Every structure is written in structure tokens, then in C-alpha cells.
Amino acid sequence: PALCRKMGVPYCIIKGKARLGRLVHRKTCTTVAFTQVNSEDKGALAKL
Amino acid sequence: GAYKYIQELWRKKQSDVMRFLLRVRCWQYRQLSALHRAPRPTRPDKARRLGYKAKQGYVIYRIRVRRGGRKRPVPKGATYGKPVHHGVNQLKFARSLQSVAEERAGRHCGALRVLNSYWVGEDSTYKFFEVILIDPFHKAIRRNPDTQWITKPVHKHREMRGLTSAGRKSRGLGKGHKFHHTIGGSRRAAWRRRNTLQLHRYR
């Protein structure tokens, strides 16, 4: 959190490590990063 | 960079975060039993820089050692003869508690090899170490070079012959003028070489 704060990248604390792991097709995963996204979900980002 | 952040954080042991974590983990290791198998390394950066890899065949054992000095095991505190040998209480063991932790881990799981060990919190009464063990018959370990040296038979009970990192630190051998006591390979090798008598054929 201090690192993402200082670099100014938005970060969130999700409730569930297994939920991250299941979206990345493993058992658990610690963190997940969003890089650049296609045009039709840029607006979904631009609210979230 | 993540492991570098964990490394700096674990050097900052007297910070409030780390002293909280150390106290709570010390509490739960105290509630567990004396010899215990961990499901994963508590300190992964320390374990990997000590040799551990996340493969099948590397296991981690948490060992608890009752800390303090060594008391002489003589009845009623009576050693016999020579006041220089009358000592009972303030005596100290020649090896470290970390080395005896590795030795207890090896003696229980005597079919594995002790690679190394590190510290995971003490107490006033106990000291908790984690010992990296290796199964030397897993294929994932003896079907891969750079690690089948520990499957070779000259490495059985490294922690009992004194040649892990902690046991080597106890043996006290190095290079230079600090270490003349062990200048033939070991202490009694040096003692033997400088206390034998070379009686040549032509003297």
C-alpha cells in the first residue's frame, strides 16, 4: 500500500485470496495487476 | 523487488509491525508441539537464500529448543576432584541451539537430508527455528542436476557430523590468523598433526 500510494497507482484490498487464485486458475494468488485495457471497458475503468 | 522488501522488513525487527508479528507467531509456535512440520516456509526469502526451492521434495520442519546454558549432568552437583573442574552451573555448550535444532530434525526425519535452517522467533524459554529438509529419493530432486549432490551417500547426517552452516560456525574454522586451531581441516586433525612424532627412516 505505501508503494502504490507513493507511485500513485490505485490499489484496492479485495476480500479473498482464493477468489484471486480462482480467477487466475490456481489455488491461491496474492496480488493481481491491471495493465492497459481495450476500448469498450475503458469507461468501466473510468468509473471504477 | 518483493523479496528485497521482505528482507529489509525482517531486518527491522524492533518496529511495531514486526514485533507484533513476532509475538503472535511465537505464541502459536509455543502452543504447537515441539517438533512440527510446517506446510510452507514462514520466511520464503530467507529459505530461498538458504537453499530452499518450491519443488516437491523440499519440506520444512519447525523445531523448538529449550534455551539457556548447559548444566553439568552430575548427581547433587558433585564433580569429583580438581576445583578447576568443579563447575556445574555457568557452563556452555560448544554448539549452538540452531545446530541442536537441525540435529533433532535430522534425527526424527532420518530419511531426509538437512540442508539448512533459520530463526523464526524465540521467547525467553524457547527458541524456534525452521529447518529445510530434502527428500533425496524424490525424482524431482535426483532427476535434476545442481541438487543430486545431497542425494549422494556422503551427505547422510550433515547436521550430526557438524557440516551445516550452524555446525560449521560452531566448529570455528576459517582462513587466517584467527583460525590456527583448525589448520589441517579440523581441530583434532590439527592436534593430531602437531602432536604426532615423525620418526624418519634416516633421522
Place this chain on the structure above:
Amino acid sequence: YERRAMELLKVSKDKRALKFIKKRVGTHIRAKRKREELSNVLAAMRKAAAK
């Protein structure tokens, strides 16, 4: 011990602060450089609170 030495440096008893840091870390060289780094920290936070 760093925070207690920082209190000593805020009250500006620098000889006492050096003797204290030397008692905690053991060596005069390490104590001198720890004292200069804590004094740098105090000066930085002081000018930050000033501006």
C-alpha cells in the same frame, strides 16, 4: 532506542545521546553515524513541519 535518542536530540543533549547510542549499539563509529542519521531525520521533519 532510536526514538529515545531522537527525544534526546530534540532536547539537544547531544553528548548524552551519543553515550546512549554507544551503549545500545556498542561501537563509537556506529554510534556517531547513527547519531548523524537521526539528526538528519530530525532536521528533515523540522523543516517539513515549518513549511
Place this chain on the structure above:
Amino acid sequence: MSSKVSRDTLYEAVREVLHGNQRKRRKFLETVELQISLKNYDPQKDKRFSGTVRLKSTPRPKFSVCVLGDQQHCDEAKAVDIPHMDIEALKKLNKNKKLVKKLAKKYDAFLASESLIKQIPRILGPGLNKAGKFPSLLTHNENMVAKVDEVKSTIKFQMKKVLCLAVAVGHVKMTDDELVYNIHLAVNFLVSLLKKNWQNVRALYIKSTMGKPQRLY
């Protein structure tokens, strides 16, 4: 205590004089002082090496060293034109008599001679030793060769067994551009010897009728 403003933001080091431009605050002439700041003293011990320097100030409060030089350095005495008298007139001068409104404590540093001092404290009035004055050699006032301690006659001080002293150098009516080489003597003449005492550096106090804050470190 101090003056009215009682503030300083400078360190006022020994590589500094740079102070004193409105010391004449009121209409009168300020009795400027000079002191020493010997700290760390043990009251139950004895210490020595009295200080006696020539402090070039040319002041208004001024005594002299004129008594008595009994017919030996006449060539040195008639340049300043002393009242040249005898031992019976020294009986008059001293405070055994009751003649005129004369300051019995006029000159404490009397003239260092080798003749009259043998017979001063036997037939004269003991007001010399109750007032605590003696024509000794501390004053370095031989006054026989050409000129040593006659024309200026600096106000002298002493290093007793006491902690703090206050002896006035006198008056100025001027700036400190002669003081910049007049006064750097106290710290060196104290730290030259007797190192079972306080260290080198400290401030100095100058308080008077009105003592401006000039605590030269």
C-alpha cells in the same frame, strides 16, 4: 540580571568582535567593564597566578602610581611631575592623621621601591593593610629605566581564591576598533597554566550602570 531586551540570536564567537555602536545609551559615559568566567572551581582549594596586564583603554576613572619613589628615579618622576615628598609627609598622606577631606583609599597599587617599603608597616598607620594595599611587585612598576607603568597606570585585577570578579577597565567614549587588538588576553592567560580547572571557552559579562547584552563567547 541583564538589560531590558534580554535577547541574542548570535553565537558571538572568539572570531568576532563586531559589537558596540550605541553603548552610550543615555547622556552619561558608561562605566564599561571586563570580567573573567572561570567556571568549575572547588571552594576548598587554593589557586595562584594573579593577572596584571596593560589594557589600552585611556579611561576617565583613573588612579595613579606616584608614591613615593624616594629620590631615586627623579628623571622618571619629573616628566609626570609628582608631588615629591618624604617619609614624614607620608605619615601626613596616610590615614593616621585627620587633616583634610582626602581619600584615604586613593592609590592601592603604590610605587614598587626598594628603600621605604622596609619601614612602611611599623611606624605608619595600619590603614594600608586594613584597606589591603601594598607597593608590591605584582604591579610591575619599577619606573627607573625609561617608562614602564607611569603615564597610563591601568586599573589592575587579581586572581584570588574567589569565583567571580568585577573590575572596571574604565570608560571609552569611542568605538571598539582599538579594542579589537586591545582585548584578546583573558582566555589565553588563563589557559596557559593550571589545567586542573575549567576549559577554554565561555561568554563574558559586562554589566554596569546599564549593561548592554554583549556576551562575547
Place this chain on the structure above:
RNA sequence: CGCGACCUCAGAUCAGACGUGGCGACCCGCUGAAUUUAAGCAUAUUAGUCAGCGGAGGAGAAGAAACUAACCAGGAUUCCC
């Protein structure tokens, strides 16, 4: 008021493996005396030795400098003079 996912644990005559004990001349890790000598004896010596405990291999340990040095410098370990 259930259904999943992970974590942390448990059980099994589960599938496949591995350790134990012996020998111990040499090797490694501990532990470790007293006789003796000091013309007594306590530090010292005997001796980090005997006895005791553990672990090996055809050798073992050590080993590629947080070294020696102070020179015009040498250059892992082991062994011999």
C-alpha cells in the same frame, strides 16, 4: 441456514519409495576425567587425552580469501621439509 473455494490439520494394511541395525583401523561432531609431574599441593600438567554418546566413506574432513602481508609483494584446500 445449505452449497462451494482456500488455509490449517487428521486418518488409511491407500500407490510407490526411503530411514532404523552392524563394523568402527583411519575420519567428523560433541562430551570428557583421574592416575601422573610440579620431589607437598590447589592454578598449571597429564589433556581436549582415556573412558562415554552420535554420524559416515573408500577415504573422510577441508577448500576456491570478510587470507597472508607491509614486499619490487604473494594468491583455494590438504600433506612433507
Place this chain on the structure above:
RNA sequence: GAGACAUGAGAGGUGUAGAAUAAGUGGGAGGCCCGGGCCGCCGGUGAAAUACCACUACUCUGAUCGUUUUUUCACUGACCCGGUGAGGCGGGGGGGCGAGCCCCG
């Protein structure tokens, strides 16, 4: 709470003829008072007197706001003791049996 702790801070003493003790490290024969001063001082040759300029700090100070040390009380969560086949622990809801306790009808 107490304790020296950062500190501010009113406050001085006599063997005594003294204009209290005119006392402490200060001492001009008056800065300054109205173009006057003053407890006194070369005029008890005076405890070094001291009409004045009380810078070292004088039996030295009630307290201020801070950092630091100890005493008592309380809490539980480490730690300890006991019991048990870890069997009803802590808080909370109605008609209510009885005080009728209660605006009281």
C-alpha cells in the same frame, strides 16, 4: 499520586554605636532627581559600611508545561492453578406467581 527531572521564580539576615542588617559577585563621590533628589559615603578612620549601578547567586520559590524514575488501584491477553465425560457462562424478550413497588382510575 509521589520523586531531582523543561523550568520559571517572590524571596538577603546582627559580635553590633548603625536612619532595618546602609550585609551578599556591584562601589559615581553622584549617574540621576528638577535648571534641587535620595537609606549615606572618604564625617562610629567604621564586618571590609554600602548616598549607588543587587552581571555570581545569597535560609534560595509556590507552581507552570514538557521528557524521565517509583508507589497504589484496576483490566486481561501472555503465563500459572483447579475442576469436568470442557453440560446450561455473559447479555437480552412476554403473560406473571407474589411488594401491589407504582401516574393509580
